Design a protein around this nucleic acid. Structure first.
Lengths: 287, 595
DNA sequence: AACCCGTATATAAGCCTAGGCTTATATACGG
DNA sequence: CCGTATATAAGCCTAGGCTTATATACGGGTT
DNA sequence: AGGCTTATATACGGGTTCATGCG
DNA sequence: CGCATGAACCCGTATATAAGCCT
């Protein structure tokens, strides 16, 4: 006997919006339960109880909806097989009880920034989350099932974007090398009159530009302190004691000019650094 | 041509008294030092100081009156800075020919003055400070017509006259970037910067999470040993002495070091000047000749002659280019309605001065220039924007990049600057920074004793600092140094050549020795003296181009002299003292007795 | 009498750096 | 016994500068 | 401008020329 | 009255800085 005077039962599994990526068939269980728990208590179904299958402002499909769900809970010819309860246990271990939402938000970001497969570089930035291993454990799983995540569309096209922003730079890195490896006396001869500038106030001298690159080559593209440095390198080289403007440019403004310059040189070797990249040999695939 | 196509009129070619250096006139190295002589003291702080002045100069509006009267000297005396030793300073200065012993500034001039020289420097200190951080005054605030930092600020008995500002600096010390000097040289002699040291992850990754996209963007992260300052236990920036005791606190040299880095700091955060260098650069029109690292005036590099010669060549070209257009079908018919305001009347003002050409005798061709210049100006409208005979120091663009101390440059030798003083804005009465035309005369009158220091004084003459120095700057070397690997660290490319009247002569006289073209090709000075100054210049083509330029330099400096001399004398007779109306009379009047 | 034009302004449309505002860990109260 | 909702700071949504590039007349007078 | 060749200084051991001390 | 032994300077190659020379 049991005196439990309530109104509704619990017609709903767990909040899978925070799906820690677990065997999708594990929902078929929490519904085989939801139903069994229902009749085991008796809490009759109602059109009212029709909230998950709502989306209806009193049509004439509800004529059967209630009396249908009714003979699905009342008719629970499956209060969980002794093997089913096994399949239950095993599946709710294969999942990721650990991962949550803050662990994800921070992950997905860095997982694109600090590389894409660069686990260590992204795992390390989740120390309180769970260990290096504990991270990788979600890793392969993530991609093994990326095509099964709420808004996986949006969450991917943001990771790829932070990659296309990283490869674009690393490629510029090379382009800068090639161009420099070319001029014997760069400080003078080095110039890229192909994608320079159109009708814009070229505050920076054709020379200065050169300099700022030669230093970019000195410390190499590194999305770090590079432009902070060159500013010093400018403040150092006494050849520009009097080029007030040059030291009148902050590592910011200065940096900007770079992001311009770079891209300029980019539209100069993307026809050779992508074709020379296309021909890369393997084991059984000759290019 | 159809109607004889007008002669080519290239604007850039006719630079408006503003060529440029591109610092490539030297893709031939010649660090050679054949110009040895007693009046050649190699001074390291030389460069830096110039910076200071020039900085004040190009911002005449942002400094008090007395702040614009500084001379290269004023700095020296101010901060116990003695030229000579190529290691920085040099306690003492040899007085007289034979005298192994040396003298300090006290032993030298008067103590009162020495104080002044300090006082001024320190004024400039708080000045720069208030200018940098105290940018709450965007020009038009509590101090509209009157620079923000004034003398009364420096003579407040307030304990923390410098502390408050100073404090605000250290707050942003690291961020702003410390000076090369004040960095703790990498505690290891193994590290650089192109390479990093901290190997984060011991190993890299191999079998990665995504097989299909092996993109291993970040194989490993590193750390960078960036330019760090010194421990607060040895970081002059945190010297407690300064707080309540001005700038004199730092070691003689260190005083300079801070000053310099202070200027660079200013024009890179100052809600004032930095915001103003924009409006300067981002002007609504770029220089016809283009944008460069450093621009200078025409006559600075072409010599007084050609700078006018080119003008004649041009002032005559434009005459044709006008009269071939003036004698054009389309144009003649449209003068019965006034095709243009100027391009109609200017046609007329030509045939009136052209009739003055064949007018007087032939020997008076030297008259046209200094007799028709004013009436020739109007013509330079429908053609060239700006032209050779102009004043550089009046046009926005031709400023930021223009170094108002360039005196020229000589092949296989180098550049020659003369750190002067005030040059822009008010009190431009006796500034030698003007139209070559003006300058020419303004100097000439001094050579003839038509303009005494008196006259110099009567017209805001105190506005220009009296004392001065000449400087040879080994740009050739400092170039081949950077261009090959930016090695520089503790080297020198600056040298003193003189520091007053007679000294200038000892250099001028010295100059000829090189200009002399060794006619000693038809073979077949003093003896035993090239022991303290070698003279003859290398007889060979490559060094001809040099002489020619060296010549003008003499020519100029020779003319400059007189006005320079008088400046010195001025500060000796007068010395901060308004003329007046009830006083002016008596002043000049006293000279009637003098004579 | 219609052609082509090098210049120069207006205006659209990208990255970066900078505030204002919800977005998820638990703990409170009542009946 | 639980249910309905703030406390408390971390992260994303959307705004403003600063540059870079594209489309419409300008008198030029020729052929 | 780019390469030669000849030349002038400048530094280092080798050793010639005077002058002290001694029998 | 001359012989055995130092100090200053004169003298000969090695090397670096620069002008002469040339096409």
């Amino acid at each position: 006997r049991s005196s439990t005077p309530s109104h509704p039962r619990m017609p709903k599994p767990h909040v899978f919006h925070s799906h820690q990526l677990q065997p999708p068939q594990l929902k078929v269980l929490y519904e085989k339960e939801r139903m069994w728990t229902a009749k085991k208590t008796g809490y009759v179904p109602t059109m009212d109880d029709v909230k998950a299958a709502y989306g209806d402002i009193s049509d004439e499909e509800e004529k059967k909806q209630k009396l249908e769900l009714l003979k699905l809970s009342v008719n629970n010819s499956q209060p969980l097989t002794e093997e089913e309860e096994k399949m239950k246990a095993d599946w709710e271990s294969e999942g990721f009880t650990n991962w949550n939402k803050l662990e994800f938000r921070k992950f997905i970001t860095v997982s694109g920034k600090y590389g894409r497969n660069s686990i260590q570089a992204i795992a390390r930035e989740l120390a309180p989350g769970k260990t290096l291993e504990e991270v990788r454990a979600y890793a392969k799983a993530f991609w093994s099932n990326i095509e099964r995540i709420e808004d996986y569309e949006k969450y991917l096209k943001i990771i790829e974007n932070e990659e296309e922003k990283i490869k674009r730079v690393k490629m510029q890195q090379e382009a800068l090398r090639r161009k420099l490896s070319e001029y014997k006396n760069p400080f003078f001869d080095l110039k890229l009159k192909h994608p320079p500038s159109s009708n814009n106030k070229r505050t920076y001298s054709e020379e200065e530009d050169r300099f700022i690159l030669l230093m970019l080559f000195k410390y190499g593209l590194d999305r770090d302190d590079v432009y902070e440095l060159v500013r010093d390198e400018i403040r150092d080289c006494p050849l520009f004691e009097l080029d007030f403007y040059f030291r009148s440019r902050t590592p910011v403004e200065l940096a900007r000019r770079g992001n311009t310059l770079l891209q300029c040189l980019e539209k100069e070797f993307n026809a050779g650094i992508v074709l020379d990249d296309a021909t890369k040999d393997r084991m059984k695939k000759e290019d | 041509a159809h109607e004889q196509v007008e002669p080519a009129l290239i604007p850039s070619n006719w630079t408006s008294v503003i060529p440029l250096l591109t610092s490539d006139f030297k893709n031939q190295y010649s660090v050679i030092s054949r110009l040895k002589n007693p009046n050649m003291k190699p001074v390291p702080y030389a460069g830096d100081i110039i910076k200071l002045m020039a900085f004040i100069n190009k911002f005449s509006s942002f400094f008090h009156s007395d702040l614009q009267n500084l001379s290269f000297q004023d700095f020296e005396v101010g901060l116990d800075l003695y030229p000579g030793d190529p290691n920085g300073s040099a306690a003492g200065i040899v007085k007289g020919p034979e005298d192994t012993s040396l003298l300090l500034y006290p032993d030298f001039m008067a103590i009162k003055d020495i104080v002044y020289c300090q006082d001024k420097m320190n004024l400039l200190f708080l000045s720069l400070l208030d200018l940098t951080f105290t940018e709450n005054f965007d020009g038009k605030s509590a101090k509209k017509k009157g620079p923000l930092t004034t003398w009364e600020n420096l003579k407040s008995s307030s304990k923390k006259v410098f502390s408050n500002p100073l404090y605000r600096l250290r707050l942003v010390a690291r961020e702003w970037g410390y000076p090369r000097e004040w960095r703790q040289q990498l505690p290891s002699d193994q590290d650089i910067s192109k390479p990093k040291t901290a190997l984060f992850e011991q190993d890299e990754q191999t079998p990665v999470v995504d097989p299909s996209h092996p993109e291993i963007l970040t194989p490993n992260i590193y750390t960078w040993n960036a330019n760090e300052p010194l421990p607060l236990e040895s970081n002059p920036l945190y010297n407690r002495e300064m707080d309540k005791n001005g700038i004199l606190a730092l070691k003689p040299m260190d005083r300079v070091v801070l000053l310099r880095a202070l200027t660079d700091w200013c024009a890179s955060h100052s809600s004032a000047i930095h915001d103003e260098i924009y409006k300067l650069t981002h002007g609504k029109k770029d220089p016809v000749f283009g944008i460069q690292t450093q621009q200078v005036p025409r006559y600075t590099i072409e010599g007084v002659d050609n700078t006018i010669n080119q003008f004649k060549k041009l002032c005559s070209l434009i005459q044709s280019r006008y009269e071939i257009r003036s004698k054009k079908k389309h144009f003649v018919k449209q003068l019965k309605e006034g095709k243009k305001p100027d391009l109609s009347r200017k046609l007329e003002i030509l045939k009136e001065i052209k009739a003055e050409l064949k007018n007087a005798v032939k020997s008076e061709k030297d008259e046209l220039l200094f007799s028709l210049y004013d009436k020739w100006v109007p013509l330079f409208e429908g053609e060239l924007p700006d032209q050779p005979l102009a004043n550089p120091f009046s046009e926005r663009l031709y400023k930021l990049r223009l170094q108002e101390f360039f005196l020229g440059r000589v092949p296989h030798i180098g550049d020659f600057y003369m750190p002067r003083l005030h040059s822009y804005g008010d009190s431009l009465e006796m500034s030698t920074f003007t139209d070559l035309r003006n300058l020419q005369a303004l100097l000439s009158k001094f050579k003839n004793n038509e303009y005494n220091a008196f006259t110099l004084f009567e017209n805001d003459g105190q506005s220009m600092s009296a004392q001065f120095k000449l400087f040879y700057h080994d740009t050739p070397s400092l170039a081949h140094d950077v261009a090959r690997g930016r090695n520089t660290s503790g080297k020198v490319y600056w040298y003193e050549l003189c520091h007053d009247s007679a000294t200038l002569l000892e250099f001028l006289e010295f100059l000829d020795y090189k200009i002399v073209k060794p006619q000693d090709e038809k073979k077949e000075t003093t003896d035993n003296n090239p022991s303290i100054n070698t003279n003859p210049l290398p007889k060979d083509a490559k060094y001809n181009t040099a002489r020619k330029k060296l010549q003008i330099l003499k020519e100029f400096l020779s003319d400059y002299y007189f006005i320079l001399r008088q400046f010195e004398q001025m500060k000796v007779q007068f010395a901060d003292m308004k003329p007046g109306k009830r006083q002016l009379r008596r002043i000049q009047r006293q000279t009637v007795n003098y004579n």
